[model samples]
Target: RNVYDMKIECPHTVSFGENSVIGYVELPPVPLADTAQMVPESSCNMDNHQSLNTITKYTQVSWRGKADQSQSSQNSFETVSTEVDLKGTCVLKHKMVEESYRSRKSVTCYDLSCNSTYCKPTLYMIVPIHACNMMKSCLIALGPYRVQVVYERSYCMTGVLIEGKCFVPDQSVVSIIKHGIFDIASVHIVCFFVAVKGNTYKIFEQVKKSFESTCNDTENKVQGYYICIVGGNSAPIYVPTLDDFRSMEAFTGIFRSPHIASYSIVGPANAKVPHSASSDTLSLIAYSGIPSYSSLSILTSSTEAKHVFSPGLFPKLNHTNCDKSAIPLIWTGMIDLPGYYEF
Candidate 1:
């Protein structure tokens, strides 16, 4: 039995593009402490959506000529625009137009699946763009009668309003019984089963536009290879971002379906995953909080510059180190596979 502990270090600086800002409110015309830092010039103007939908009738154009051409023109065509080009953040950028003698400063990593060494054992977690509220740690398995859990990160934020696509996380599990050996082929089977099950989830509901186009076949193939490297060969595992988490409503536990794929390995519901001989279960704890910045910084694109305001200027909404009311749900379970069964 193999058991492992995992840790993820949050970054000091978190950067974002234009549209992900959820709108910033001025703090009593002054920095009010603990509340988000604000600049007088700091206003949310990203709310302008643009579109050219005038040609609704879709009148056809002459095939060959325009205004009596000597020779007839060619193809007749129809055109129209049902597009609402939502542009910029929902609110204008925060600005401190008034107070000049300002006093302060402030705050905020993962793509392990792509790394060739993604399958190797480690006690650390890989982070992409979004910082997650918690780190989920579990004693995974290999062999027969195993259970697998897969989480996909397919949504994103630009700053305030613009939201889109990101990445997905996938892993599989089992253990040998009755002299059954855990082999490369068995690992391959676990990898294949997970890839198929993870692909069918409703991954784009929270996103403003569909990101399925970006997370195409190539990504699926890479994840399959990585899964084989980790759970396919060894046991136990540990492993989003915060912005993506805030606006997301989609996550799934891999479930079995009658229509399993050709190369897939199916396990009954009662099957118990392998665990560490030393300890059958492990403990997990996670939190989402900045390491505590002295001040807050409001950065924007217009002048390619940023401004610092004392967090003392913001209201005190923090009940704890991070956003208290908003936290992700996480838990753990175990299945004991005794010495029995066949390979």
Candidate 2:
């Protein structure tokens, strides 16, 4: 019997604020055959019993105020109207799609927030019943061939090799028989990091096995191989370094490096990659004390005190206060402090 039903769960209540998280909804691992029609529905209830339209209006007003603060803040509020609508939406995604591989998926609401007074937002979701089943491995059939894969565990820790085994049937067509080359089985494992635009798949590790002698023997046609996916650290996967942040600032033209001030050269332009030797030299100017604003204290701690410096490395003074303690003063050309100065 094909039974189609909706399953709902509200694990916790989501609060309303700036960049507030609305939590996530776990869905069952099911085949993709009937999954495309399984669009999940989401909603949020206000504690004040106000209509969603009113909540949306309040949220828009608050976001608009934030947008007025800075250009980047404005980009965040541009999507608030569509996101705060009554028909709440979520990003539904799965890790991988392959036979015998359970499609682990979830619905996550990232851009949800409310700013109305006396309003406490609670999120709810309705997922298809097919997404409520237990995850398990299964056998994959390709023509007359049967392939079975088993993992050491459902989840593997970072920097740990994912252990697994692949079992091929005796009647399976060998790659050597079809391509006139040694039977080569290759396994490529990739990892993806979630992002607002889309997740990018990065090659983590790959392993290949050549069954030259094994495929030559008729008795050894059916074989099992222990496949180990090499482990890797997350540093190169997603963690951004200081250089990355500097590059981003330079690309956006929000922050310019003190050593690399751009100036037009009054000479014939050479057709070569532009390089600045002065930019490579480190600057001696550095911040040695706490900032003037108390709010900026949140951006600095004992651990990161050494890296704390004035925005744009502008020349500033560190005058002693009543207690004779030095305090850093940030100087900028603009009267209104920029939002990116939070760094």
Candidate 3:
């Protein structure tokens, strides 16, 4: 009698013979098959009708902008807006052994007329469901933890999911969103319950906690790193990998800076330690990130740049219609937040 986040409002009843007396038993329905086409009279037995209210947690955005003047060797500012109907396909499957699920998620921005060389940063968004409501079903993924993207059509533009590389566990993904650590994004998800044959659904908070950080010199020193990208009239910024962390270590080894902290993932520590800077008591950490793309100044003085979720100081891209205004372009290359914090 376990419901996978589904609410069943049915009247109580009893069974006396082959027939049981029940009212409004809200179980999913099954219909006749169309043998001619080897299909169901309804849409995949009407399973594609299911949808999940989701928020986009992590996204990798990589695209480049057109540079001004053919000889500038520099690129112009780039901007991505919620101007199109945004949609995606997420393949979810249950890991019975782990009693959980993993999802391969991908979403595209619609009508984005960018070239193949366009490279941009990944953006983690919390989009509202109302933003995308109409959806369709697709045939993908075999069950166990398998769920497919049917469809949704409620955005200015829509992008089809290209199959995600990240196999995020269900709990970890939802946990962040439930705690408001991540915002909401919408999608159509066809779900399967091990106990309940095949179906999917959706619907449906806040908390804050902190633990003491041992606060080590390594953690303090390597807590963050700087980022800068140049030479991209038609190319996107490079995405940093764990190997880049080693590059930072190497960079720091040669030209050490008192302001920068050096950190690495050790045995007990995971290699995915986020990059941030903290010299004292309070530490400003970047919880989430876009793929990797910033401003022009970042390409120059953009060094010592740190990714931060809390507002204060950090290299932030000044998005503008470069050709419309004649004002001098500026990018906040270095920022320091001494009195701001977020949990």
Candidate 4:
């Protein structure tokens, strides 16, 4: 196995409508073994059209469209693409933003398309606009209560987790405002996932909000605010328990059904099979964190045992170490022709 590593450096912010040097890529040198002369047949199938010198010759940099939308409109599209010939380091400098009003956005998406023999896929980079009027901090005030909210960044990428904190003063009036006659139970922090669509920001969906209590007893009364915008919780994997299998079979002996026949490749009961060899058995064992024998009993003794583990149905190969000697190789040519086998 060969490990290929490359370094990409990009600026955190870029000025709009200005021709500036945004970033550069440090390409690793080609190995001497790869450049050595080879036999004609061995090198025939190889992609010899791309050399070290011509690797970054077709390197292009262009501004792509918005994150959530398609490339149907020419609003954020770039007319001309910039090509950089990368020898050891490729410098990316271009007038990324246009003079139109549409270029005045908080975040811009760029596509670095490398049309080399080794690298074919485009690398995406999101650069925030410098000196833009993006809100980073806000204040929400009431009669005696005030909340100072500060965001980690002005803008964020899709599926990326953003952090923010709310500051509240420790006062007796704030406690009265929260738990007393007003009954403003707790602070709720909600985030709206929005997208810019044709000069208007539209909220597509809202993320689930959460709250946590904090205290500063050294000052005065208890003062706390909700933590805002956390990453989504991991999805739970539900595996059928032994009781669940018994309920499905109605406590009968191995419930045989047409649906149960699909899980025949799970191997015999108590047989040590590699988890990576079969996905059905792997999910049954790996997700449930069950032992090998327990997982087999769940599959074999629960529902449709005989129909799934029928004789001559599957090969009796133990894939623990994945030994080749355990597999039976049959010569189909000799079986097809009896007289030719004798000759």
Q: TM-score: which candidate is best? A: 3
Instruction: List the candidate 3 regions with Cα displacement exceeding 4 Å.
Output: 1-46, 52-72, 78-80, 83-85, 89-343
* Per-residue accuracy of model 3 over 1-343 as CA lDDT, tens digit each: 2111111111122111111110011112111111011111112222343222122121112122222244333222232211111122121122321211111121211011112132121111111122112223423221111223333331211121113311111111122233333322222211111111121210000000011212122111211222211110001111122334322332222122211322211111011102221211111111122212121111111112211111111122211211111100111111111111111
Task: Judge candidate 3 against the unseen true structure and give its global Cα lDDT, from 0 to 1.
Answer: 0.18
Each model's C-alpha lDDT?
0.17, 0.18, 0.18, 0.18
RMSD of 1: 27.5
TM-score of each: 0.13, 0.16, 0.18, 0.13
Model 4 TM-score is 0.13
Expressed as tens digits, the lDDT of each residue in 51-111 for candidate 2 is 1112110011111211132332212111111112222122112221111122222221211
Query: What local lDDT does model 1 show for residue 38?
Result: 14
> What's the C-alpha lDDT at position 287 in model 4?
12
Task: Evaluate model 1: give its lDDT.
Answer: 0.17
Tens-place lDDT per residue, model 4, 1-343, is 1222211112233223231111112222222122122111111112332111222232122122112243233232221222323321111112222221234322111111121111211111112232123434333221122223232331322121123322121112222233332211122111111111221111001000101112112121111111111111111101111233212221111111111221212212222122222222211101111111100011111111110111111222232222210111100000010010100
Instruction: Locate the minimum summed-lDDT window of 10 residues in model 2.
Output: 294-303
Backbone steric clashes in candidate 4, count:
0
Against the true structure, candidate 2 reaches a TM-score of: 0.16
